[PDB]
Amino acid sequence: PDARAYWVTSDLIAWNVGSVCLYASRAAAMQGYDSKVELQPESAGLPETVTQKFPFISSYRAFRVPSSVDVASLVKCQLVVASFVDVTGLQLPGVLDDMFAYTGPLGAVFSEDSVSLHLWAPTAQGVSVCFFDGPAGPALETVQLKESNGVWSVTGPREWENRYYLYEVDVYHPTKAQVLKCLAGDPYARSLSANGARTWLVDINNETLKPASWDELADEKPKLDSFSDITIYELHIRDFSAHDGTVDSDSRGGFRAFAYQASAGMEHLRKLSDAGLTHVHLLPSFHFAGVDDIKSNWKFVDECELATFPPGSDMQQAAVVAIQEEDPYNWGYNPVLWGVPKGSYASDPDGPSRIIEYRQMVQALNRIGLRVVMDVVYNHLDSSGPCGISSVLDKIVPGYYVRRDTNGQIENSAAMNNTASEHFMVDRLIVDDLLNWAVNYKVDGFRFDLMGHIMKRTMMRAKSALQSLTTDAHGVDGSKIYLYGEGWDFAEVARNQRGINGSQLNMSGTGIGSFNDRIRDAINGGNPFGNPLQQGFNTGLFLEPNGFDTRRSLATYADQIQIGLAGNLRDYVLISHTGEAKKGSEIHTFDGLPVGYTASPIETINYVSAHDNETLFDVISVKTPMILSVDERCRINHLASSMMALSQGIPFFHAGDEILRSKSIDRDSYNSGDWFNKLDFTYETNNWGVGLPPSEKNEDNWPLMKPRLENPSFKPAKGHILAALDSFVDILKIRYSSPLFRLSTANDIKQRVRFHNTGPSLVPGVIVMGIEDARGESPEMAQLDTNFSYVVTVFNVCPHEVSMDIPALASMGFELHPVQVNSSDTLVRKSAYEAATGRFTVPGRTVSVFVEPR
Ligand SMILES: OC[C@H]1O[C@H](O[C@H]2[C@H](O)[C@@H](O)[C@@H](O[C@H]3[C@H](O)[C@@H](O)[C@@H](O[C@H]4[C@H](O)[C@@H](O)[C@@H](O)O[C@@H]4CO)O[C@@H]3CO)O[C@@H]2CO)[C@H](O)[C@@H](O)[C@@H]1O
Numbered sequence: 001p002d003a004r005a006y007w008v009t010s011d012l013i014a015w016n017v018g019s020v021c022l023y024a025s026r027a028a029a030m031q032g033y034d035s036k037v038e039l040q041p042e043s044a045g046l047p048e049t050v051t052q053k054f055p056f057i058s059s060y061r062a063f064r065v066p067s068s069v070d071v072a073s074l075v076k077c078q079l080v081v082a083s084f085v086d087v088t089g090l091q092l093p094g095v096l097d098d099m100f101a102y103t104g105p106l107g108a109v110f111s112e113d114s115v116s117l118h119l120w121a122p123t124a125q126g127v128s129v130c131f132f133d134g135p136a137g138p139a140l141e142t143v144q145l146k147e148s149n150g151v152w153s154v155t156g157p158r159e160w161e162n163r164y165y166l167y168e169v170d171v172y173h174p175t176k177a178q179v180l181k182c183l184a185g186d187p188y189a190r191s192l193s194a195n196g197a198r199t200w201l202v203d204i205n206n207e208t209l210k211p212a213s214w215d216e217l218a219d220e221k222p223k224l225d226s227f228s229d230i231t232i233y234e235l236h237i238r239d240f241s242a243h244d245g246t247v248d249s250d251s252r253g254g255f256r257a258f259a260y261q262a263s264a265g266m267e268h269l270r271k272l273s274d275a276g277l278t279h280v281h282l283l284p285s286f287h288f289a290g291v292d293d294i295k296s297n298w299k300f301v302d303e304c305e306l307a308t309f310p311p312g313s314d315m316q317q318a319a320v321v322a323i324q325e326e327d328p329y330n331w332g333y334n335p336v337l338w339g340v341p342k343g344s345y346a347s348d349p350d351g352p353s354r355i356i357e358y359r360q361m362v363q364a365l366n367r368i369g370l371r372v373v374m375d376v377v378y379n380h381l382d383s384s385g386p387c388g389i390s391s392v393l394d395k396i397v398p399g400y401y402v403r404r405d406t407n408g409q410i411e412n413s414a415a416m417n418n419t420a421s422e423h424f425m426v427d428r429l430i431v432d433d434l435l436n437w438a439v440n441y442k443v444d445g446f447r448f449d450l451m452g453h454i455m456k457r458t459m460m461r462a463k464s465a466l467q468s469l470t471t472d473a474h475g476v477d478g479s480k481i482y483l484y485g486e487g488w489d490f491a492e493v494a495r496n497q498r499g500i501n502g503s504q505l506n507m508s509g510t511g512i513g514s515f516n517d518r519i520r521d522a523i524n525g526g527n528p529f530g531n532p533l534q535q536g537f538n539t540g541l542f543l544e545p546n547g548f549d550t551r552r553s554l555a556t557y558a559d560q561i562q563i564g565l566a567g568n569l570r571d572y573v574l575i576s577h578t579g580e581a582k583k584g585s586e587i588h589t590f591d592g593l594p595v596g597y598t599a600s601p602i603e604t605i606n607y608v609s610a611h612d613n614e615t616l617f618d619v620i621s622v623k624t625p626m627i628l629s630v631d632e633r634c635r636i637n638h639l640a641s642s643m644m645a646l647s648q649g650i651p652f653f654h655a656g657d658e659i660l661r662s663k664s665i666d667r668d669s670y671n672s673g674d675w676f677n678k679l680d681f682t683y684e685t686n687n688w689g690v691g692l693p694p695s696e697k698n699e700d701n702w703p704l705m706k707p708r709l710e711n712p713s714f715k716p717a718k719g720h721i722l723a724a725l726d727s728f729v730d731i732l733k734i735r736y737s738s739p740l741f742r743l744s745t746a747n748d749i750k751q752r753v754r755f756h757n758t759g760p761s762l763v764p765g766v767i768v769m770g771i772e773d774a775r776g777e778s779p780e781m782a783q784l785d786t787n788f789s790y791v792v793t794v795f796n797v798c799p800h801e802v803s804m805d806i807p808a809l810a811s812m813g814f815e816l817h818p819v820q821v822n823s824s825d826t827l828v829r830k831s832a833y834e835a836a837t838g839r840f841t842v843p844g845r846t847v848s849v850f851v852e853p854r
Pocket residue numbers: 221222223224273274275276277278366367368369370
């Protein structure tokens with residue numbers, strides 16, 4: 001309901017009114033009040049601490065609450081303020097933090113002879129714990145908790161260990177205008193019964209929950225010398241093994257599939273890892289809503305039936321959509337409890353298997369040379385309110401963990417039920433959760449979904465806390481833990497309205513990565529929410545119009561790409577296409593923001609593809625001329641991935657980039673099932689032409705999709721898929737062949753990286769990037785590379801051979817990179833350098849890497 005006033009401190013209420021009284025009713029009877037308190041205007045106004053925490057109400061009038069008021073009692077009541085007649089509810093987070101900020105133990109604490117439970121519920125009238133013996137059995141016992149400063153607690157005997165439980169919370173819910181008895185899980189849960197119906201009272205440190213040699217994992221972690229050595233591969237746990245016939249049927253789709261060391265999927269990851277891939281980013285793997293943890297409840301359509309339907313038919317999606325709410329599939333961006341592994345990915349959803357198997361997965365990946373990144377989703381909740389298994393946080397302290405507008409309505413810009421990390425206990429829970437995953441599961445990094453919705457102070461505190469973990473004290477080397485996220489700035493958090501948020505610009509100089517949407521859009525063309533047929537640097541703009549000024553548009557995109565290739569730095573200086581020398585931050589995007597915004601290459605996550613939006617293969621198939629062969633499109637796929645793999649900064653690959661993965665042009669496949677998200681590690685298909693994708697997100701584009709999906713010339717064969725994989729692995733090998741591709745500082749990049757095809761007379765469709773190392777005695781720089789003294793990369797998107805003469809690079813000892821001399825691709829082997837003129841000759845649609853050997 002309507003809540004326009006804010007209770008910001010124990011003694012201050014803020015309200016934007018041009019006499020004011022506070023009314024309270026413990027029974028929610030409001031006439032009907034048990035308390036009436038006149039508020040006096042506070043001539044001192046709002047303190048600086050209040051305006052800093054809640055900038056959007058800095059203009060509001062301040063009213064003093066008399067110190068004789070029992071604030072702790074009143075916050076448990078139905079409350080209104082009235083002006084003299086305007087009446088409105090009160091938003092309590094400010095006063096709840098001021099009075100009841102709590103840093104003590106929450107959830108379960110185990111000592112030698114006892115177990116304690118602590119729940120933060122300062123607005124609750126009563127809290128009990130209901131114990132169950134077993135995940136499905138009836139209640140065995142109820143015990144009352146005692147309150148101190150808004151925290152409810154009880155201490156019991158050690159025998160309480162491994163019971164299941166829920167909290168019975170009597171609390172006022174504004175959405176129902178009643179004090180309701182709510183049955184709630186523990187926000188600090190570390191395990192659950194199926195679907196989070198009950199919390200398992202488990203000691204996360206219990207030795208039987210640790211796989212063999214778990215405590216020695218630190219010794220077995222893959223080497224990571226620098227964050228600048230990171231490459232990331234983004235993978236969904238179910239996608240990985242759902243279709244993998246080399247994994248036993250009962251272990252497909254979950255954590256256990258990673259324990260099959262010689263499966264097609266694991267052999268695929270070993271191949272990438274051995275080539276130099278360092279990190280695998282797993283899509284949400286905590287307790288999310290939308291998939292039943294009980295596998296026998298899953299509905300699946302028969303894939304053999306779906307395979308009989310025409311390639312451009314709407315029948316496949318109709319079938320999938322009919323049961324998409326009851327199938328095994330979701331990306332999982334629907335948070336319920338952050339600190340527990342998803343039950344649907346475990347062999348048994350009740351109790352220990354989800355803990356052990358998660359740990360086994362981390363161990364398995366580490367032992368094949370891959371560090372593990374978790375996709376963490378702290379920006380919103382699946383559900384709010386007092387009802388249902390899927391609401392926990394807002395069930396216990398309504399209106400606190402969620403961000404609300406100035407009328408008191410929940411903000412939904414993230415998707416639904418935005419969180420308010422600006423509130424003390426939300427911040428606490430986020431950081432506590434991160435430490436849980438880092439310490440209890442030895443996770444190597446975190447990707448923050450909608451980091452722009454998270455306060456920068458939360459991000460920086462998390463970074464500090466994680467980075468200071470040690471092997472001696474905590475079992476993990478915190479100094480190697482890497483953080484990155486989506487720094488999009490929109491809706492209610494834009495322009496720092498709720499405080500300094502984790503936007504791209506605000507995270508410059510923090511050492512926390514953000515996705516570079518500039519290089520993505522310049523390469524592919526347009527934007528995910530723009531015209532689908534708008535072409536870019538690598539999809540035929542100017543050079544190969546699709547038929548649905550452009551020389552200058554192409555050159556503008558080339559400038560944006562080059563800033564990205566040099567780590568997307570604010571201060572890197574480029575000769576722009578007009579001839580003027582410009583800093584990365586002085587080259588602007590179409591919406592007026594600086595292209596280059598980082599202080600370091602480690603703050604840039606360079607990508608052309610991810611789980612969101614169309615796959616690399618699909619975007620290329622939509623934007624390029626219809627007349628191109630699939631053979632040509634395969635080369636274009638390789639060019640895009642190579643621009644990432646040979647960029648300064650941190651390359652990010654979508655799982656399947658390397659094997660032409662399609663989703664039949666689905667732009668948002670979160671609930672599109674295994675059918676549209678198929679990862680085929682037999683390499684027989686890429687999943688192109690499996691029907692029109694679900695109407696929900698795609699129907700407006702079906703007319704462009706249908707003819708392409710139906711055209712057999714668009715579909716690659718196994719040969720194309722294997723060719724893509726081989727060349728992908730080669731370019732990875734090249735990145736890790738020389739530290740020059742992975743410079744660690746902006747200073748190094750400004751000193752060493754130069755672009756050689758620039759200015760108003762630049763050759764369209766070609767980027768030439770040179771990287772210098774020390775050469776000769778008493779050099780101007782340190783020697784980073786023992787094998788090569790100089791590297792030159794030529795990206796040629798033209799459909800014809802090009803010869804680039806660079807006088808600066810003439811009379812040197814350049815050769816084609818040994819990996820490319822040794823390539824299975826016939827075209828790249830034809831690449832050549834001629835010293836007399838410094839001429840680099842590169843075939844059409846090819847990336848050629850040249851080295852000067854020592
Ligand atoms: O198979 C028989 C061999 O068994 C033993 O070696 C194993 C290791 O025990 C495994 O853990 C693994 O280790 C490899 C890993 O597969 C490989 O990717 C690479 O790891 C790199 C990583 O890729 C890279 O990103 C970088 O950052 O650091 C990692 C190294 O820290 O190298 C690992 C080996 O060092 O596989 C090998 C088999 O290759 C046993 O020791 C051998 O004697 C035996 O032959």
